[PDB]
Ligand binder design. Structure first.
Ligand SMILES: C/C=C(/C)C(=O)O[C@H]1C(C)=C2[C@H]([C@@H]1OC(=O)CCCCCCC)[C@@](C)(OC(C)=O)C[C@H](OC(=O)CCC)[C@@]1(O)[C@H]2OC(=O)[C@@]1(C)O
Ligand code: NA
Lengths: 50, 397, 50, 49
């Protein structure tokens, strides 16, 4: 159980580490003011892979 | 019925020059009649355009009053029955308007004008005289080569403009540093031997790398730049004016820092470091330590490190004039990256390799030390990054 | 004649003047580090000649 | 001598030559042989041919 709880504590950190990494992989989206990238549409994408 | 026909690419090439805001004037020893007819075939004149006041024989041009001759040169696109002198004269009038003028030809009758013009361009299959009197030669007699040379010329100048501003911006900060310590009474923060290494190798590579920055796309869709366009002026003056002061205080600062708040040689936290001269003379004054602590190669290494680190940052800031690195990433010019890496690798070399730091009067610094330099240097990027933001918004753009 | 014209530039002259002044101040220093004192004069000279 | 050396960009001329020399070789590929390095800069500035 200690081993399984440990795995969980580490896992939550790795996921976060990724969710933040993916955010950095797509920073260039602040260079295209077209309507095809409103705050709502893009947000859904991160909360989609999250 | 026969004629001396225009080359195939000519018409197209004339259009491209026109798109780049470049005018084309025909100056020929041939007769007016055929000179105009060729002008129409290649697009210098319209099919049914009226050229009564846009085409002249050399004599007709000479008869015009001294005043109107100059104007005719800005209006007319065809000069015929000309003598060698007429060509250089026409070129001279053009230059009287401060216009950068080019001359293309192949005959010895073009030599004078090819000499007079800023850019003499000879045909690859033309006479030796024309060639030896020119700045360039079109190895393939193709007029399109001119356009490509103009594009290359514009691109090369935009890059030169960058590394020129870069290297010269650096020299500004260095002067501030030498002046700060001079009036602040502080000791030598940077010796000449160090500056030379920075303005030749440290910044040398970065500068060269800037010469290979990617050229703009609309470069041939813009008119010619004014010959009097200053490299640094206006907001860029103040901007570089600010960047200079920072580097001047970051170096003189990181140097005075070691002398007071560093855990390697504390000094008078009351700024009495200003009297480091009155140490060997009146030791029992407010010293209590070896006076050779001022000639210590530790603080200077702190100054140089900041200088070097700042420059490498200002090198990435030179990739563009008013564009944030967020828009134009530092990796847009791979040669620039490999450039900064080669400069830093040579900085560590000038510190560790004993035979060097003894000459440049330096001394390697530990991890904690570098972490400091990265706190007075790195912020220079955000500094200029802000100044840019102010230009493309609060200003014209 | 070509060489003489290489030293007509103002800055190249100022840099040359600084070289000589730097060479004079060289003969006025302790003998603990003299082998690494005439570097500035030579370097600034090696460049101008380059 | 410190102010002099600090104000004058010692390497500027070496950067220019290298740039121009490499740019010329690139132009030669475009079939434009440049006999005068300083001309490269002036060409792009041409307003009248
Ligand atoms: C190299 C280093 C320095 C510090 C130098 O003296 O450069 C000045 C100077 C001569 C000019 C200036 C420098 O001016 C100042 O820094 C203002 C005076 C305060 C200095 C006080 C010292 C603590 C350039 C360098 O810099 C800034 C940052 O404003 C920009 C520009 O130069 C260009 O456009 C380059 C042309 C090859 C020139 O105003 C130029 O004068 C001209 O005729 C120009 C048109 O050339
Ligand atoms: Na010429």
């Amino acid at each position: 159980q200690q081993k399984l709880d440990e795995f969980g504590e580490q896992l939550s950190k790795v996921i976060s580490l990724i969710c933040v990494a993916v955010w950095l992989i797509n920073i260039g989206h602040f260079n295209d003011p077209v309507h095809g990238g409103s705050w709502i549409r893009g947000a859904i994408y991160y909360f989609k892979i999250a | 019925g026969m004629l001396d026909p225009p080359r195939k690419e000519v018409m197209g090439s004339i259009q491209l020059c026109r798109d780049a805001g470049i005018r084309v004037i025909m100056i020929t020893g041939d007769n007016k009649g055929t000179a105009i007819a060729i002008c129409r075939r290649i697009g210098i004149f319209g099919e049914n355009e009226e050229v009564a006041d846009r085409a002249y024989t050399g004599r007709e041009f000479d008869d015009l009053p001294l005043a109107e001759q100059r104007e005719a040169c800005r209006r007319a696109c065809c000069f015929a029955r000309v003598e060698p002198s007429h060509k250089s004269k026409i070129v001279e009038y053009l230059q009287s308007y401060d216009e950068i003028t080019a001359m293309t030809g192949d005959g010895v009758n073009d030599a004078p004008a090819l000499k007079k013009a800023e850019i003499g361009i000879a045909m690859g299959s033309g006479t030796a005289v024309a060639k030896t009197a020119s700045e360039m030669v079109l190895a393939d007699d193709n007029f399109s080569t001119i356009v490509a040379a103009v594009e290359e010329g514009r691109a090369i100048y935009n890059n030169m403009k960058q590394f020129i501003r870069y290297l010269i911006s650096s020299n500004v900060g260095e002067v501030v540093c030498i002046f700060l310590t001079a009036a602040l009474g502080l000791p030598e923060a940077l010796i000449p031997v160090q500056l030379l290494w920075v303005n030749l190798v440290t910044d040398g590579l970065p500068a060269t790398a800037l010469g290979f920055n990617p050229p703009d796309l609309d470069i041939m869709d813009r008119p010619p730049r004014s010959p009097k366009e200053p490299l640094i002026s206006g907001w860029l003056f103040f901007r570089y004016m600010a960047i200079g002061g920072y580097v001047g205080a970051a170096t003189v600062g990181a140097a005075a820092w070691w002398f007071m708040y560093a855990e390697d040689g504390p000094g008078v936290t009351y700024h009495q470091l200003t009297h480091f001269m009155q140490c060997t003379e009146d030791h029992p004054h407010f010293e209590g330590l070896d006076c050779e602590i001022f000639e210590a190669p530790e603080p200077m290494t702190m100054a140089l490190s900041v200088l070097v680190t700042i420059e490498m940052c200002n090198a990435l800031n030179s990739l563009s004039e008013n564009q944030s690195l967020m828009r134009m990433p530092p990796w847009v010019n791979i040669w620039l990256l490999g450039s900064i890496c080669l400069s830093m690798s040579l900085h560590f070399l000038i510190l560790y390799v004993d035979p060097l730091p003894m000459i440049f009067k330096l001394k390697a610094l530990d991890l904690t030390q570098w972490l400091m330099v990265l706190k007075i240097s790195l912020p220079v990027i955000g500094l200029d990054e802000i100044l840019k933001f102010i230009a493309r918004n609060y200003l014209e753009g | 004649e070509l060489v003489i014209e290489q030293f007509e530039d103002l800055l190249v002259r100022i840099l040359l003047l600084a070289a000589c002044i730097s060479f004079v101040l060289a003969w006025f220093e302790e003998g603990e580090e003299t082998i690494t004192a005439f570097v500035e004069p030579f370097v600034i000279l090696l460049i101008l000649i380059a | 001598v410190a102010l002099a050396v600090a104000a004058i960009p010692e390497g500027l001329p070496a950067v220019i030559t290298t740039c121009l020399a490499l740019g010329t070789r690139r132009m030669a590929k475009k079939n434009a042989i440049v006999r005068s390095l300083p001309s490269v800069e002036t060409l792009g500035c041409t307003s009248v041919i």
